[PDB]
Design an enzyme around this catalytic site. Structure first.
Site, PDB file in Angstrom:
ATOM      1  N   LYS A 222       0.860  -1.191   0.000  1.00 39.79           N
ATOM      2  CA  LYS A 222       0.000   0.000   0.000  1.00 39.79           C
ATOM      3  C   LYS A 222       0.896   1.240   0.000  1.00 39.79           C
ATOM      4  CE  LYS A 222      -3.579  -2.686   0.517  1.00 39.79           C
ATOM      5  NZ  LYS A 222      -4.590  -2.922  -0.547  1.00 39.79           N
TER       6      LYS A 222
ATOM      7  N   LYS B 139       2.406  -8.988  -2.102  1.00 36.05           N
ATOM      8  CA  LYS B 139       1.693  -9.030  -3.382  1.00 36.05           C
ATOM      9  C   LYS B 139       1.446  -7.665  -3.950  1.00 36.05           C
ATOM     10  CE  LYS B 139      -2.864 -10.003  -3.627  1.00 36.05           C
ATOM     11  NZ  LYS B 139      -3.344  -8.637  -3.994  1.00 36.05           N
TER      12      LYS B 139
ATOM     13  N   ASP C 285      -1.086  -5.081  -5.490  1.00 39.22           N
ATOM     14  CA  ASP C 285      -2.531  -4.899  -5.377  1.00 39.22           C
ATOM     15  C   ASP C 285      -3.190  -5.350  -6.682  1.00 39.22           C
ATOM     16  OD1 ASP C 285      -4.737  -4.170  -3.774  1.00 39.22           O
ATOM     17  OD2 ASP C 285      -3.747  -2.334  -3.165  1.00 39.22           O
ATOM     18  N   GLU C 286      -4.461  -5.727  -6.622  1.00 38.64           N
ATOM     19  CA  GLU C 286      -5.126  -6.267  -7.807  1.00 38.64           C
ATOM     20  C   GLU C 286      -5.061  -5.307  -9.003  1.00 38.64           C
ATOM     21  OE1 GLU C 286      -7.005  -5.583  -4.887  1.00 38.64           O
ATOM     22  OE2 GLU C 286      -7.591  -3.662  -5.694  1.00 38.64           O
TER      23      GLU C 286
ATOM     24  N   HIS D 274      -6.818 -13.530  -7.670  1.00 37.16           N
ATOM     25  CA  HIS D 274      -7.577 -12.473  -7.027  1.00 37.16           C
ATOM     26  C   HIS D 274      -8.969 -12.420  -7.652  1.00 37.16           C
ATOM     27  CE1 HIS D 274      -8.808  -8.517  -5.722  1.00 37.16           C
ATOM     28  NE2 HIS D 274      -7.859  -8.588  -4.808  1.00 37.16           N
TER      29      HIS D 274
ATOM     30  N   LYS E   2     -13.110  -6.270   6.572  1.00 35.54           N
ATOM     31  CA  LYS E   2     -13.852  -5.127   6.038  1.00 35.54           C
ATOM     32  C   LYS E   2     -14.824  -5.485   4.913  1.00 35.54           C
ATOM     33  CE  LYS E   2     -10.313  -3.777   2.688  1.00 35.54           C
ATOM     34  NZ  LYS E   2      -9.051  -3.024   2.386  1.00 35.54           N
TER      35      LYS E   2
HETATM   36  O1  CAP Z   1      -7.303  -4.218  -2.030  1.00 40.83           O
HETATM   37  C1  CAP Z   1      -7.524  -4.659  -0.880  1.00 40.83           C
HETATM   38  O2  CAP Z   1      -8.402  -4.112  -0.168  1.00 40.83           O
HETATM   39  C2  CAP Z   1      -6.749  -5.877  -0.399  1.00 40.83           C
HETATM   40  O3  CAP Z   1      -5.394  -5.780  -0.935  1.00 40.83           O
HETATM   41  C3  CAP Z   1      -6.640  -5.941   1.124  1.00 40.83           C
HETATM   42  O4  CAP Z   1      -5.957  -4.820   1.628  1.00 40.83           O
HETATM   43  P1  CAP Z   1      -5.789  -4.720   3.228  1.00 40.83           P
HETATM   44  O5  CAP Z   1      -5.021  -5.945   3.682  1.00 40.83           O
HETATM   45  O6  CAP Z   1      -5.025  -3.454   3.479  1.00 40.83           O
HETATM   46  O7  CAP Z   1      -7.164  -4.711   3.831  1.00 40.83           O
HETATM   47  C4  CAP Z   1      -7.382  -7.157  -0.956  1.00 40.83           C
HETATM   48  O8  CAP Z   1      -7.242  -7.159  -2.366  1.00 40.83           O
HETATM   49  C5  CAP Z   1      -8.858  -7.320  -0.632  1.00 40.83           C
HETATM   50  O9  CAP Z   1      -8.908  -7.860   0.666  1.00 40.83           O
HETATM   51  C6  CAP Z   1      -9.550  -8.294  -1.584  1.00 40.83           C
HETATM   52  O10 CAP Z   1     -10.789  -8.654  -1.014  1.00 40.83           O
HETATM   53  P2  CAP Z   1     -11.264 -10.183  -0.993  1.00 40.83           P
HETATM   54  O11 CAP Z   1     -10.183 -10.984  -0.337  1.00 40.83           O
HETATM   55  O12 CAP Z   1     -12.606 -10.219  -0.266  1.00 40.83           O
HETATM   56  O13 CAP Z   1     -11.441 -10.640  -2.446  1.00 40.83           O
HETATM   57 MG    MG Z   2      -6.011  -5.497  -3.083  1.00 47.60          MG
END
Ligand code: CAP
Ligand code: MG
Ligand code: CAP
Ligand code: CAP
Ligand code: MG
Ligand code: MG
Ligand code: MG
Lengths: 140, 467, 465, 356, 230, 140
Positions: free
Chosen positions: D56, D82, D84-85, D175, D215
């Site tokens: 982040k 990782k 981020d997506e 993801h 969250k």
């Molecule tokens: O972009 C985000 O929010 C995260 O990197 C989490 O960040 P944090 O660790 O800072 O919360 C994940 O991609 C989400 O959790 C995906 O959700 P899910 O697993 O429900 O598909």
């Molecule tokens: Mg993410």
């Protein structure tokens, strides 16, 4: 703010971030193996063969992905198939560490249904090792 | 001790001004029109140009001693004052053949014109001519086909070829492009062409154009019984894209593509010429951007050098100028380009601006292309200047005909054939040209219509690039 | 409104002084000198027409499309003060006129034919406004300044380089020998001269191998990352790519290309190859002064620099102000800002005719090179700041003690000036003192200071604003 | 099955709840490149959940800063970091620059710690050719793992990538970006249980499962149904769990569930209780939001995980004693104590939309 | 002391709700129909959507300070309550063009709709519209041909084009597929088509279908004198 | 003519060619950081991890271009965001070097607008290091 030391702070996978396991704590882990019907085994390695390395990749083309040397250690005897006696496991820990007092030694257990190692932790490091920190010296 | 390394700055003329040097038959020679800053002697300026386009820099370097500066240095071997100018000189520089990468026009320019034009010590510099020796000429693949082979492939003899740039320059759809092409070709033009700036754009993507143009070429060829072509533009943003466009033309079986050699560049152009040689495609070369470089008398590179460079890099056609049209290029200078691009051997002739004898050692000749603001009334003058071995292009002069493209094409074709016939009959086109066209406009209604629209149209202005 | 055959004035279609430019239009500022008797409106209109959609006589095919949508438009003409027959003509070109990602195409339209028109005596393209919507169609520089510094692990000072000399005539082995000695003394980079490609005296692949040995030797000796700009400039695209591939296979950091003599089509291909393979790309501007020297005709270097940023390059030569080649301080600074910054405001006093928004395209490192030496160091640091490469060819290989001491001299000079600036000293006022103090400390620098103390390049400027 | 029928005028709403994929159809799929057992064996990691972390801010970091953050996270005790997506290739950070600096970081942390490390390098791209170029670079760097956004990239690209990963020995983290567009509402769409089955067939070594406690929405029992459907060989019909059909996987490898999104150290006992060892637990904000930085943040998470794992092995009930386990650990570890303090009050408790 | 790193959770609205922001002509804009959970203010919900689809996560991270959140953050810049709904709002979010990979619809969706639809703090979310600015549009190759070029290649003008999906959807052999295609095309349709779910299957493998369909297209085109396709 | 020594003459990037920075000179560099609103940070490394190396390339195909190991050092605490007090920076230099007296330590600063490190120089080397020369011994 405390600073996590990068110097001589090598770890050893599961439980390496906790205080060193007491004899009671080791015994409790052995009880867990037996309670779940898993197969205990001991493995060991000399210091030079203890941590993952890359040396064999000199022989490769572009195929190093998820190849590392030193993942395999050496088996102490055989896995203890059919063992349901925690005291037998503890006795083999003593026998292995006595035979190889300068080796790294880990206790592992196998699940034959998943066909995978299901637990594992270090039970001995060589007294000469200087590449690790006691818990209270991991940060400064 | 003998001659050792002495650090520091000394005059370039101590090493690079060699007025007693006898040039070798393998040397590349350059003629530079040089305008020194006040207080800089011409010998020093010429030496600086020779040094900084060959082996030297601004201070003495020790590494010279490891090699033989005598063997490698460029040499200013002669300086002549320019008549009518108080502060202009022609400096002649000889470069050993060893300085140059074989087959690379890019490398030759990088040395000769790379840095020297920016020197603070000169006010202006123009490269006027280059003597490319046969031993260097032979290192180039050169033109994919050249004039004789092109005529033989097209089965076209005994007259100038006729072409036409589609207009408006930009803004037509692929289908409308092919429509205009078919109508032009079917009326008697041998070729049509993409405008130099038609590559691939939102209003018309290249592959759509290539396909519709193929349909048009083959329709007009079947209708007329004469071989037809359209110069499909391979000019592109990258070499890979340029090659994709050439490959499509190959796969459609069409005769000819084009490239903008200066805006695409010599490295791409040489690659494309090699592709055309290997796949049997004619290559028309457009000289877009040349006047940025070649227009002014005091600074830049004269087109005669840019033309030699193209013959080396490779092209089957090259634009030469018209003398009489909308873009500048005096008759005598145009003829020098024609001879330098077509002929095997061109003798030194200062009255023509030809500073060196040029021997092409059997490198194929390039077809000159006269284009830009020309129309039917210019035909006698063009046939007299160029003779048969040229392409005469009429864009506005075809698509501006009041009856449309086919009648426009026919008008140009009749005019050309009438002038050719007259020439063959022993008529002097320089004196009788007006009569020949007038007689032809009286016979052909299509020609008459063209003659009427453009009767008063001339392009007569003060010439900037005077010899 | 139908088709009427014949010639009419260009101004009836292409002079549109009430046109409000669109934010996606490409704009051009031309300094035009009409022939006597040709009104400036007609000249500007002709330039607009013949660089966009028009020719010399009316064509019927216009009616099939929308000339309103596609035509170039001369939208303003201003007389030039102190000139009786020069004007700045402003031309707007719809974004639809241009091939995406192709500098070649942009130049073909804007500068393709108009410079040769009989009706003008001279024409110079002064500036181009490249709108964000067109900028975004380009791959652009393979890496850019931030990424380059991060890959090299070099921060807090200008980079130092050096062209090997003599320009031509050294063997491959002697080339690497010279390179090793330069790099080991404190230079970050050395480079092939622009005209060093492959030749009888030294074939390229031999050079590349010996230079690789030299780079790795100097890097191991000094503990600092080193590179040498290996010249990929070649006669054909295939040869150029072969040279890039060898550099890739040797693991070396950087290659170079002569973008104008190789050309934009090859350059853009090479920049894409460098992006895809992690090579830095140094751009040499060989031939630019053929085009950009004279005030009345050609293309100003500010346009050639923008074009390179679009086509792609990690470094670009900018001029020095103080060295052997022409380029005044304020004009140099304009190049620096146009090549490094994200946004440069219109400023006529600087020769910047249009606001240029780069929409996050990476910045290109300016390279100062040509007849510079140690006494110039404070002025160079003051002009460029840290984000530049300063190249000393003669200024290294002309050191009386050889290349490694020559390199050390330059490195000490640069570091002393940098330290002094950081300490709050005004290099424009105290630069002489700063270099003098340094020459008094370092024997290597003292030797350089002595050799070149009297050497200056001070001539009347041709390309004045 | 879902092509046109959801748009029929004759219905007001339609939701695909479940699919029974028979063994004869399952066997036609290459499936996951490796699966859980092979992944643990390649990484030499056994006896606890794996720990990861999304770098982040999501977007805006340079390639060098990305690698810096990665090294600091990995060196403190995380197994993985990782992309981020939405980190693909962008003006602020081009992909190949990131891949190289991340490789440096992985290898530095691995050498420093003596544990195998990885970072899921995102191969998600605008075209299949670009996606493959990114996968090839990861192969050529010798790194362990890449990632793909299967729904936004799409099944055709995903299946191709999974086959590439099988052929070249790369782990593939999946993801589920965009899934909640489809799977959130009870009356219309496609339930995640079907999207998870589809991914297991198309191919992935990891798949995000939800967290229950973080969250993003996903109730405990539903989360467990995803975990079993993705890991197990055979899942019996159980309407009380929303499992409409018995699913037989006929030895298709299991996919590692990944718990991610708004989780922190206080959630550790609940996570270990839900997932057991065969999961990856990801702490993005829960690592890069630690007051002492990434390495201490990583160490805090690693200590929490190991303490919960040890306690479970010793026979402690994490459902009842979890709070005590974390409290004891926060008292022992200064790094963990700092994390415990910052996030003590932080919970995500809202009405559940996707109720069974 | 300037603004530094403060660990812990704060409201998204402190960073990502920017009602005074003037959108740039290069920003990608999104209009989200959002239904917050009870007790979540619309400004906070809109800010959360902006944050978690751009640069932000659930707790403050120190790494923000190495870059410029001003430059990169998504911004909820307007909130409109919805016509007739007590608890529904249109949240408008602006994304800097720098956030997006050139030419990648995949990337654009991954940011804008990747995770936000699953947040516990919202009950429902719909993406209603996107403003794709010209500077981003120009990064896409786009349609292979488009309407004008299609009509010009097919030589078809002055009326709608007519097509037809072959039926039954599945279950026809390759030879019967081409039989049906020929008969449809020859009667005056411009196009026929594979059903969306006709790919390659045990009852009809794709390459067999492609060959018989080719025969059918060419037979119908020759018969009618009109260009045909399938 | 003096000869630049190739033996035990390793450098450390910016300012390594100048006399060693005095306490006053270091203080002046810190003032420059603060005056410009840049973000100070300290980084450190053990001797074996101090200079660029190639070891990881054993795992690569033909992708080593501008890859080197040991460019990353280890962060001391966090960058000092919001720090406008030069004395705080100097105190952290003392704290870092006290905690890691055998490590290499460098002071760096970041510009968050350019998003790049904008300055940096070495502030400590191990007393055991023998691979560098004092200024007057760099040439012979
Ligand atoms: O972009 C985000 O929010 C995260 O990197 C989490 O960040 P944090 O660790 O800072 O919360 C994940 O991609 C989400 O959790 C995906 O959700 P899910 O697993 O429900 O598909
Ligand atoms: Mg993410
Ligand atoms: O763009 C044009 O203006 C032309 O298509 C001619 O159009 P018209 O036939 O309608 O005049 C040619 O490209 C120029 O002649 C090139 O100049 P040159 O041959 O001097 O290089
Ligand atoms: O060939 C030369 O002269 C140089 O190698 C400089 O050598 P010195 O360092 O020995 O002077 C450079 O290529 C020029 O400076 C280029 O000019 P510019 O930067 O103006 O494009
Ligand atoms: Mg033209
Ligand atoms: Mg040079
Ligand atoms: Mg259908």
């Amino acid at each position: 703010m405390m600073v996590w030391t990068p110097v001589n702070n090598k770890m050893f996978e599961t439980f390496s971030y906790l205080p060193p396991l007491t004899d009671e704590q080791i015994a409790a882990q052995v009880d867990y193996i037996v309670a779940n019907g898993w197969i205990p085994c001991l493995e060991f390695a000399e210091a030079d063969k203890a941590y993952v390395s890359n040396e064999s990749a000199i022989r490769f083309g572009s195929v190093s992905c998820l190849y590392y040397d030193n993942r395999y250690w050496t088996m102490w005897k055989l896995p203890m198939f059919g063992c349901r006696d925690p005291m037998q496991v503890l006795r083999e820990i003593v026998a292995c560490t006595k035979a190889f007092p300068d080796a790294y030694v880990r206790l592992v257990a196998f699940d034959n249904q998943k066909q995978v190692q299901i637990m594992g932790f270090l039970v001995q490091r060589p007294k000469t090792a200087r590449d690790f920190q006691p818990a209270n010296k991991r940060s400064v | 001790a003998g001659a050792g390394f002495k650090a520091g700055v000394k005059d370039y003329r101590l090493t690079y001004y060699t007025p007693d040097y006898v040039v070798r038959d393998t040397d590349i020679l350059a003629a530079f029109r040089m305008t020194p800053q006040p207080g800089v002697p011409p010998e020093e300026c010429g030496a600086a140009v020779a040094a900084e386009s060959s082996t030297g820099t601004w201070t003495t370097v020790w590494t010279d001693g490891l090699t033989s500066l005598d063997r490698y240095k460029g040499r200013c071997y002669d300086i002549e004052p320019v008549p009518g100018e108080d502060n202009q000189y022609i400096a002649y520089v000889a470069y050993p053949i060893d300085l140059f990468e074989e087959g690379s026009v890019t490398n030759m320019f990088t040395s000769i014109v790379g840095n020297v034009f920016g020197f603070k010590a000169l006010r202006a510099l123009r490269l006027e001519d280059l003597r490319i020796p046969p031993a260097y000429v032979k290192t180039f693949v050169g033109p994919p086909h050249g004039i004789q082979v092109e005529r033989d492939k097209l089965n076209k003899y005994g007259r100038g070829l006729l072409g036409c740039t589609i207009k408006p320059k930009l803004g037509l759809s692929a289908k409308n492009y092919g429509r205009a092409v078919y109508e032009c070709l079917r009326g008697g033009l041998d070729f049509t062409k993409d405008d130099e700036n038609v590559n691939s754009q939102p209003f018309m993507r290249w592959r759509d154009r290539f396909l519709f143009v193929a349909e048009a070429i083959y329709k007009a060829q079947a209708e007329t019984g004469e071989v037809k072509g359209h110069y499909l533009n391979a000019t592109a943003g990258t070499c890979e894209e340029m090659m994709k466009r050439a490959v499509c033309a190959k796969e459609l079986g069409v005769p000819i593509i084009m490239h903008d050699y200066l805006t695409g560049g010599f490295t791409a152009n040489t690659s494309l010429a090699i592709y055309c040689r290997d796949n049997g495609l004619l290559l028309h070369i457009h000289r877009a951007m040349h006047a940025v470089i070649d227009r002014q008398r005091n600074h830049g590179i004269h087109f005669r050098v840019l033309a030699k460079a193209l013959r080396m890099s490779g092209g089957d056609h090259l634009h030469s100028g018209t003398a009489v049209g909308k873009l500048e290029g005096e008759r005598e200078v145009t003829l020098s380009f024609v001879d330098l691009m077509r002929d095997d051997y061109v003798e030194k002739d200062r009255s023509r601006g030809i500073y060196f004898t040029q021997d092409w050692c059997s490198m194929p000749g390039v077809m000159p292309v006269a284009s830009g603001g020309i129309h039917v009334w210019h035909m006698p003058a063009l046939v007299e200047i160029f003779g048969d071995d040229a392409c005469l292009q009429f864009g506005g002069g075809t698509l501006g005909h009041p009856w449309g493209n086919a009648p426009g094409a026919a008008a140009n074709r009749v005019a050309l054939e009438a002038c050719t016939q007259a020439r063959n009959e022993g008529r002097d086109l320089a004196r009788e040209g007006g009569d020949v066209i007038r007689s032809a406009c009286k016979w052909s209604p299509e020609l008459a219509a063209a003659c009427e629209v453009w009767k008063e149209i001339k392009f007569e202005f003060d010439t900037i690039d005077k010899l």
